[PDB]
Amino acid sequence: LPDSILKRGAEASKVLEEHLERGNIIRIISHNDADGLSAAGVVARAISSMNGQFHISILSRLKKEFIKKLSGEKYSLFFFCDMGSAYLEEISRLKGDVIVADHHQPSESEAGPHVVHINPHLHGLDGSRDLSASGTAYLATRLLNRKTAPLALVGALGDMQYTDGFTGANRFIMEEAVEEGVLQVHSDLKLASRYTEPLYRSIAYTFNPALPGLTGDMEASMGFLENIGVSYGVKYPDLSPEERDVLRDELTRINPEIFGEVFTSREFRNIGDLSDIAGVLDACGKNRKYGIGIGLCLGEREGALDVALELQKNYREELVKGLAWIRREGSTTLENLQYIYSEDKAFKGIMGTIASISLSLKILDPDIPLLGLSRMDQHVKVSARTTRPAVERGVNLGVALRDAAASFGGTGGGHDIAAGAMVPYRDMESFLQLVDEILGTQTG
C-alpha cells in the first residue's frame, strides 16, 4: 500500500481528533447503498469510541444545491463519504474544515486549504476494484479505531469489489482486520443468510456469487435439492456432514466461485457473514431506513435486528420479482447497449441491483452494457452496469453517463463498470441514443 495514502488518512485523523477536542458536532454526509452506509458507520463508530457527537445526512445523490445549503450551517467539520470528489470546487467553497473520503474520479479543481481529500484515484490506485468509500473512511480513521475494519469490507462487497479475492487496498484492510482479531476468514460455500434461512431459500437468495437456474428461483432451488438428496427445509449448518459434501460438489458444478473465502466477525454473528451485512444495509438503504442500517454498524442490534431482517426479506422478494420481470420482458437492444425501463414503484431503488444480477445470471447478454431506467415524475433515473470484459474492450460507464447527461444539463457519473444519471423523461430516447454513440466510440 502506498505510504502517501496512509499519510493522507493520518492527516484526516488529525483533523478529526482536533474538532472532537473542541467539543463540536461532526457533520457526516454519505450515500445510501451498502458502501455509503457502512462508510458512514465507520466514521460514526470512530467518533462514538471517543464520546463525540455527529449529524448524518444520507443522500441518493449529491447536488450543487445541497452543498450550498451546507454552505449556511455552522458546523466546523464536514465528513463526506462515497461522494464529493466530483464536486471538489463547490466543496472547496465551504468555510469550515472538510474531509472527503471517496473513490470516484475527482473533478479538476484546486482542492481548498481546509480540505483533506482521501481517494484511491489520487494515489495511483483503482477505485473500481481495490478500494471503496468504506475502506477510504477506514484509512481516514484507522489511527483512531481499528475495530471498524470489518465495516470497511462490507462496503467493498456492497460495491462488488470481490472477484474470487479482495485485491489491493481491500486486501490490506482484510489483513489488518485479521491481525486486529476482529475478522476471521475460512473456506466454505458462500450462501446467503446461512444461519437464518432454510437451504432452498438461502440458495434462491444467493445473488452473488450467482447460481444460474437457482438464484431467484424458489421452486427450482427446492427441486434441485430433492434431485440431489439434500434436505431443503434445514439450515446449512444443521445439514449432515455428508449432505454438506454433496451440496459443495453439486453447487460447484453450477459456479465454482460458490466455494471460497467466507468473512466473519464476532460482532456480526446472529446477523450473518460480511456479504450478508452488505445485503442488509442495501435493503435498509432502499427502504430509506438509515438509522436502522447505520445503527446496525454501531451495535444497536436489539429489537432492531428483527426490523432489519424483515426489511431484508421484502427487499429480497422484490429482487426475485425484479428478476422474473427481466426474464419475462427482456431488454431493448440498441447498437452498443441494451436497456430496461420501469414505472413500477416497487422496482424503485433496485433497478441497479437487478441489472447487475441479470447480467451475472446471463439472462441478459453480459457483454452488452445494460441501462436500467426508473421513472421519477418528470425525470428518469438511470443505473448502468456492465462486466469486466466490456470494460476491457473500452467501455467506461461513469464517463459516458456524465458526458451524455451533461448535454441535457443533467448529472451523471460513477465508475467504469457501474454508473448513475438523472435526465428529463422527455429526453430519454435522445439520451439513450447519445449513450449508445459514446459507447460505440469508446470501443471502436
Residues that bind ligand CTP (CB under 6 A): 31, 33, 35, 82, 128, 159-161, 352, 356, 385, 414-415, 417-418
Task: Note whether 33 binds Mn ion by CB under 5 A.
Answer: yes
Cβ density class 305-314: b for 16+ within 10 Å, e for less:
beebeebbbe
Of 133, 173, 230, 438, the one binding Mn ion by CB under 5 A: 133
26 binds, among ligand CTP, Mn ion, none (CB under 5 to 8 A by kind): none
* Nearest CB to ligand CTP, comparing residues 198 and 216: 216
160 binds, among ligand CTP, Mn ion, none (CB under 5 to 8 A by kind): ligand CTP
201 binds, among ligand CTP, Mn ion, none (CB under 5 to 8 A by kind): none
Q: Which residues pair with 379 in a beta bridge?
A: 376, 424
> Is residue 65 exposed (0-12), middle (13-18) or buried (19+ Cβ within 10 Å)?
exposed
* Nearest CB to ligand CTP, comparing residues 221 and 358: 358
Task: Note whether 102 binds Mn ion by CB under 5 A.
Answer: no
Give the residue closest to Mn ion by C-beta: 35
Q: Kindly state the smallest distance separating residue 318's Cβ from ligand CTP, in Å.
A: 15
Task: Note whether 82 binds Mn ion by CB under 5 A.
Answer: yes
Residues 6+ apart with CB under 8 A from 244: 236
Task: Note whether 159 binds Mn ion by CB under 5 A.
Answer: yes
418 binds, among ligand CTP, Mn ion, none (CB under 5 to 8 A by kind): ligand CTP
417 binds, among ligand CTP, Mn ion, none (CB under 5 to 8 A by kind): ligand CTP
* Strand runs labelled E in 224-376: 259-264, 332-333, 338-342, 370-376
Q: Kindly state the smallest distance separating residue 289's Cβ from ligand CTP, in Å.
A: 16
Of 5, 27, 29, 36, the one binding Mn ion by CB under 5 A: 36
The residue whose grid cell reads 452498443 is: 336
Is 245 annotated in some ligand binding site? no
Dist CA 345 CA 303 (whole Å): 28
Choose one: 133-141, 281-289, 298-306, 329-337; the region binding Mn ion (CB under 5 A).
Answer: 133-141
414 binds, among ligand CTP, Mn ion, none (CB under 5 to 8 A by kind): ligand CTP
Q: Kindly state the smallest distance separating residue 313's Cβ from ligand CTP, in Å.
A: 20
Dist CA 399 CA 419 (whole Å): 9
* Pair 392, 416: CB distance under 8 Å: no
Dist CA 320 CA 323 (whole Å): 5
128 binds, among Mn ion, ligand CTP, none (CB under 5 to 8 A by kind): ligand CTP
Type of residue found at 122: L
* Nearest CB to Mn ion, comparing residues 183 and 419: 419
The kind and range of the H/E element at 117 are strand 115-118
Torsion of the alpha carbons at 34, 37, 41 and 42, rounded to the nearest 10? 60
Q: Kindly state the smallest distance separating residue 428's Cβ from Mn ion, in Å.
A: 24
Q: Kindly state the smallest distance separating residue 176's Cβ from ligand CTP, in Å.
A: 21
Distances (CA, A) of 436 to 319, 337, 410, 428: 27, 6, 17, 12
Distances (CA, A) of 173 to 81, 133, 167, 192, 358: 17, 13, 10, 23, 30
Task: Note whether 273 binds Mn ion by CB under 5 A.
Answer: no
Dist CA 196 CA 279 (whole Å): 14
Dist CA 188 CA 50 (whole Å): 37
Dist CA 100 CA 104 (whole Å): 11
Q: Kindly state the smallest distance separating residue 133's Cβ from Mn ion, in Å.
A: 5
Is 379 annotated in some ligand binding site? no
Q: Kindly state the smallest distance separating residue 391's Cβ from Mn ion, in Å.
A: 16
How are beta strands 97-101 and 77-81 bridged, if at all?
Answer: parallel
Dist CA 121 CA 85 (whole Å): 10
* Nearest CB to Mn ion, comparing residues 82 and 436: 82
Choose one: 78-86, 112-120, 144-152, 299-307; the region binding Mn ion (CB under 5 A).
Answer: 78-86
Task: Note whether 416 binds Mn ion by CB under 5 A.
Answer: no
Choose one: 34-42, 59-67, 219-227, 237-245; the region binding Mn ion (CB under 5 A).
Answer: 34-42
**Residues forming the site for Mn ion (CB under 5 A):** 31, 33, 35-36, 82, 132-133, 159
Q: Which residues are annotated as a binding site for Mn(2+)?
A: 31, 33, 35, 82, 103, 159
